[PDB]
């Protein structure tokens, strides 16, 4: 293009470079020096304009990928790094992921495609992986796809808190409940429940019936999360066994959702025994 004016030929990445114009940076900064001295570029208060010129440099120097070295100290250039470029990285580290996502906090299209490249390499979404990912974007897990979630090792379910599972829709919790039910079947009773408790969004009838027998004490909130379809074919007995003493507050949700349908599907002569004064059903015999 053009040759660099006398003296301006940068022998080191100093502070001076903030004063060079767009075109001066294009010419005067050796590409090979930028790569080896990448550690320093964070500190140097460049403009966005000035960085566009430093991005395009490294693009030339590595037109096939990007050493983890550069990726480490990439600094604020992650934002300018087009998703297309990132789709071809060999990141393969947790500290570099942390590094890149700390500044990402400062959707985000780049963020997504990066994470997908860490797992796509790592092979499975491990516990410690999902631990640090949620430490920046907690609802990550409930952001993924029904299908996508299959790859998750049941071992990884342990890393999940209840926090995560608020943004989670049914068609997701469906894929999530099975895995938890395997991760948490080395437990029983006062142990099993605490853990399994959040996921019961997915849980079907058969699995709820078993819980009753184990004298579990559920609350009305948790109950209101149970699949509508899964509530219908439960006895007045099995309802009062799950809810135990919290059954008292069930009157309130009479005309709500999970229990609305349940009440109607049941005989008046059955409900009466609950001492709640619910109406709707069959007056038989």
């Amino acid at each position: 293009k053009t040759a660099c004016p006398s003296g301006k030929k940068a022998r080191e990445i100093d502070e001076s470079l903030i004063f060079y114009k767009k075109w001066e940076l294009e010419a005067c900064v050796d590409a090979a020096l930028l790569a080896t001295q990448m550690d320093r570029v964070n500190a140097i208060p460049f403009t966005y304009e000035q960085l566009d010129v430093l991005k395009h440099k490294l693009d030339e120097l590595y037109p096939q990928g990007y050493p983890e070295s550069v990726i480490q100290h990439l600094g604020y250039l992650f934002l300018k790094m087009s998703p297309e470029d990132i789709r071809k990285w060999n990141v393969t580290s947790l500290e570099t992921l942390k590094a890149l996502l700390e500044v990402n906090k400062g959707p985000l299209p780049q963020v997504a495609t990066l994470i997908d490249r860490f797992v796509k390499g790592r092979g499975q979404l491990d516990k410690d992986t999902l631990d640090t990912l949620t430490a920046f974007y907690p609802g990550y897990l409930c952001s993924l796809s029904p299908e996508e979630l299959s790859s998750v090792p049941p071992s990884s379910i342990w890393a999940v808190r209840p926090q995560d599972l608020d943004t989670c829709d049914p068609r997701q919790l469906d894929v999530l409940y099975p895995k938890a039910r395997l991760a948490f079947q080395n437990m029983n009773g006062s142990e099993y429940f605490v853990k399994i408790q959040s996921f019961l969004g997915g849980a079907p009838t058969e699995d709820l019936k078993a819980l009753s027998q184990q004298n579990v004490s559920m609350d009305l909130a948790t109950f209101m999360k149970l699949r509508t379809d899964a509530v219908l074919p439960l006895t007045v007995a099995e309802v009062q066994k799950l809810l135990g003493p919290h059954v008292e507050g069930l009157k309130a949700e009479e005309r709500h959702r999970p229990v609305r349908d349940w009440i109607l599907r049941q005989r008046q002569d059955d409900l009466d025994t609950l001492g709640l004064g619910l109406q709707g059903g069959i007056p038989n015999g």
Partner: antibody
Framework: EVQLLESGGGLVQPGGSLRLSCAAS????????MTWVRQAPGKGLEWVSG????????YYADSVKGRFTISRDNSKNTLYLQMNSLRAEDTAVYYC????????????WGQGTLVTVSS | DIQMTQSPSSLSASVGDRVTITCRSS??????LAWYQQKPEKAPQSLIYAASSLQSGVPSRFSGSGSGTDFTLTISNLQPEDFATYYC?????????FGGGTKVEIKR
């Protein structure tokens, strides 16, 4: 409008008889379990008996075992406590209480009727 | 006979205080615990069912917590209408049991 009006409470000679009566009004008496709860003058609270929503199953304190009899009448909106072989120790205010559920807490109490047992 | 026992028996506090009452069953009773207010010459009134749940028409300054064999009625920012006797009751098993009560007095 919810009102539980206990009555029949008076003075009785020891070993005497007496039947109490809680009149319900402003609820579906049919569809609630009630109990009797008594309170010694200047002492604490004590559960005495309890009838289901059926009338079928009846529970009592060992204190009053087979001397008291809880009954109910959904037609007349009434709950009854027969009390025979009354002793000095059974002197108290008797509250008729409405559970918010069978195997639940008493959510409504009556103003409560006083039974004195003396010669 | 499940033994319920409250702490303290008597407690004097001033208005706008956070008062804590204790209840302790001799045996596990999961969450089958209730709290009852009684002001003299009047009937008892329900505050808490299922160890935690507010009854309706009851101020939120009333906060029940606990399970197993340890429970806690906590009256935040006390009012004059709250100076009264408080009773914890188990409905886990017959026979049903209340505690001793806790006479909550005004302080001066």
């Amino acid at each position: 409008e919810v009102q539980l009006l206990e009555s029949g409470g008076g003075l009785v000679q020891p070993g005497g008889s007496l039947r109490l009566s809680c009149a319900a009004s402003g609820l579906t008496f049919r569809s609630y379990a009630m109990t009797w709860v008594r309170q010694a003058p200047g002492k604490g609270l004590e559960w005495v008996s309890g009838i289901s929503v059926s009338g079928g199953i009846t529970y009592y304190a060992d204190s009053v075992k087979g001397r008291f009899t809880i009954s109910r009448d959904n037609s007349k909106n009434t709950l009854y406590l027969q009390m025979n072989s009354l002793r000095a120790e059974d002197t108290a205010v008797y509250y008729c209480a409405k559970r918010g559920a069978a195997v639940g807490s008493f959510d409504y109490w009556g103003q409560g009727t006083l039974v004195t047992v003396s010669s | 006979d499940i033994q319920m026992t409250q702490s303290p028996s008597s407690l004097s506090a001033s208005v706008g205080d956070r008062v804590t009452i204790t209840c302790r069953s001799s045996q596990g009773i999961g969450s089958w615990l209730a709290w009852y207010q009684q002001k003299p010459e009047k009937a008892p009134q329900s505050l808490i069912y299922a160890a935690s749940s507010l009854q309706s028409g009851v101020p939120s300054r009333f906060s029940g917590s606990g399970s197993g064999t340890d429970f806690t009625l906590t009256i935040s920012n006390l009012q004059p209408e709250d100076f009264a006797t408080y009773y914890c009751q188990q409905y886990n098993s017959y026979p049903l049991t209340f505690g001793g009560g806790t006479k909550v007095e005004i302080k001066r």
